[PDB]
Amino acid sequence: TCGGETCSAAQVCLKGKCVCNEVHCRIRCKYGLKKDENGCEYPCSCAKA
Numbered sequence: 001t002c003g004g005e006t007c008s009a010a011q012v013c014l015k016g017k018c019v020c021n022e023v024h025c026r027i028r029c030k031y032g033l034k035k036d037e038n039g040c041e042y043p044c045s046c047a048k049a
Contacts, residue, residue, distance in 0.1 A: 010042035 002013035011018040018038075025033055025044035033041040034048070 007039055008036070008038065008040070010040035011038065 003016040003017050005018050007013050007018035010020060012021045013019075019042035020038065023033070023041045025041065027033075027044055027046060029046035031047045033049050034045040035041055041043065
């Protein structure tokens, strides 16, 4: 575990906390990237607005 929590596939355990991993997306989107419920932009997809 990561400090009492399980990190999602979008996160990495750094210093005992789940944080979003670095973001590298090639798609170009009118409203930018979609965030999951932790705020992370993984997998890369265009946001609905």
